[PDB]
Antibody
Framework: EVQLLESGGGLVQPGGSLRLSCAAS????????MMWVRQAPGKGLEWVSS????????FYADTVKGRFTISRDNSKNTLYLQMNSLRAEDTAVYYC?????????????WGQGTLVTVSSASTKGPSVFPLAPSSKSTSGGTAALGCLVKDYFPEPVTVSWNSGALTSGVHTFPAVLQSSGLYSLSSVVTVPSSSLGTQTYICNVNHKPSNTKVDKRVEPK | SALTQPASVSGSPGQSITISCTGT?????????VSWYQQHPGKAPKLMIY???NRPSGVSNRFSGSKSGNTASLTISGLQAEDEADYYC??????????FGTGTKVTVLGQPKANPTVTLFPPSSEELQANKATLVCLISDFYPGAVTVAWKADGSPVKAGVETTKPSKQSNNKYAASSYLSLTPEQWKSHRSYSCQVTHEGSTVEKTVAPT
């Protein structure tokens, strides 16, 4: 019903710039105060900026004053955040927030957020390897098979199975942050051993920062 | 400068816990504009309480809010496992700004001991063809979240090339962790069998893999 869809996030070098967007629907956009809130990874919530219904009154956290600009296009039902001179410290998930009518700070609706990474390190697409079920699987009951998603930057990667049709028995593990600064992750499916000859198993790896979309067939042996 | 919340509040099932949020006379102590949010891992925050004590529609009466001086409080009665999340207060500031609290991590104890399931994969032939080798040891469905991981090459330890994650809670409310052992195809083919052995509550589960 109420929709708050962010876009424009991504990886950027220190000193770089980005423009975030928030596409709204399901409500009379023009009668609400809109806000941006950020959250650095594993850290707390932090207010960034606010914009009044008409777009004439704006407010900013001291931490972003002079670098970030909030704006809105009421006709196009969009909230913007122009972010200039970005630094490592600005790395966070940026949430688009709708202020509850009759309040100035209370958020009734939040978006899913757009992740913004500020780093001097460049994107690295992953190398995807099949993790074939143990040689003596069809000689038993259950079989664990997977995909090793190696050496990517930054987070996240999403892993699906059989183009999203296979969801049961799927476990994508959290990534390890190696000494190299690169991540690695593994996704595993637990299937019947008897289906290993009958069923084709493919893992669908997506790493949007490097535009990587890899489909890896996982064969028994 | 920030709203002070305890970093951690732990509780048992069915119990009540109170999360405090202390500000100044120019924010929490100055106005009845204090809100509370619940946030689950990897999810967007959710409004639990607004205007100190008002609960939005669909929010359980197990959640209540109060204020005394420069301190706001969120009480959770009849603690449930699903209440385990991060909680934030927020208030309007006299500066016209908006400030969130430091956040409180709520942990709900009492769940039964769960032994880990260990899945060990040898390097893939594709990876070996790329002149690399990675042994993958996946540890899941354990509780409490404490594991020890040891790597062995047909006896004696392996310290070099080991990288283990911090145990993390999965969707089933149990912990999962991963450990990677990085080798050269030459090292991998030289030994008889490598082993991943994970220790959880004094009980060691071991998996072994070989070049075969």
């Amino acid at each position: 019903e109420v929709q708050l869809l962010e876009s424009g996030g991504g990886l950027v070098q220190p000193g770089g710039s980005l423009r975030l967007s928030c596409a709204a629907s399901g409500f009379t956009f023009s009668s609400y105060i809109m806000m941006w809130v950020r959250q650095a990874p594993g850290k707390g919530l932090e207010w960034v900026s606010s914009i009044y219904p008409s777009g004439g009154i704006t407010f900013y956290a001291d931490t972003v004053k002079g670098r970030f600009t909030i704006s809105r296009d009421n006709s196009k039902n969009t909230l913007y955040l122009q972010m200039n001179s970005l630094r490592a410290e600005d790395t966070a998930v940026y949430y688009c927030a709708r202020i509850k009518l009759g309040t100035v700070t209370t958020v009734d609706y939040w978006g899913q957020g757009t992740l913004v990474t500020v780093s001097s390190a460049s994107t690295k697409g992953p190398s995807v390897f099949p993790l074939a079920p143990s040689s003596k699987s069809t000689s038993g009951g259950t079989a664990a098979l997977g995909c090793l998603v190696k050496d990517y930057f930054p987070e996240p990667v999403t892993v699906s199975w059989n183009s999203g049709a296979l969801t049961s028995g799927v476990h994508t593990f959290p990534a390890v942050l190696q000494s190299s600064g690169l991540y690695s992750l593994s996704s595993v499916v637990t299937v019947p051993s008897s289906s290993l000859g009958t069923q084709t198993y493919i893992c669908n790896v997506n790493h949007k920062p490097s535009n990587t979309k890899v489909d890896k067939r996982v064969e028994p042996k | 400068s920030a709203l002070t919340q305890p970093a951690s509040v732990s509780g048992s099932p069915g119990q009540s816990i109170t999360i405090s949020c202390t500000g100044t006379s120019s924010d929490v102590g100055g106005y009845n504009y204090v809100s509370w949010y619940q946030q689950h891992p990897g999810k967007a925050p959710k409004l639990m309480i607004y205007d100190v004590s008002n609960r939005p529609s669909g929010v359980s009466n197990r959640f209540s809010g109060s204020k005394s001086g420069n301190t706001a409080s969120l009480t959770i009665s009849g603690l449930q496992a699903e209440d385990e999340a991060d909680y934030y207060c927020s208030s309007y500031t006299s500066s016209s700004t908006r400030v969130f609290g430091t956040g409180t991590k709520v942990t709900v104890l009492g769940q039964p001991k769960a032994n880990p399931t260990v899945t060990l994969f040898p390097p893939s032939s594709e990876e070996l063809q790329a002149n690399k080798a990675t042994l993958v040891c996946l540890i899941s469905d354990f509780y409490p979240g404490a594991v020890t991981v040891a790597w062995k090459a047909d006896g004696s330890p392996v310290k070099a090339g080991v990288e283990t994650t911090k145990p993390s809670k999965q969707s089933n409310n149990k912990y999962a962790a991963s450990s990677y052992l990085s080798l050269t195809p030459e090292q991998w083919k030289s030994h008889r069998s490598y082993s991943c052995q994970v220790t959880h509550e004094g009980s060691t589960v071991e998996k072994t893999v070989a070049p075969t």
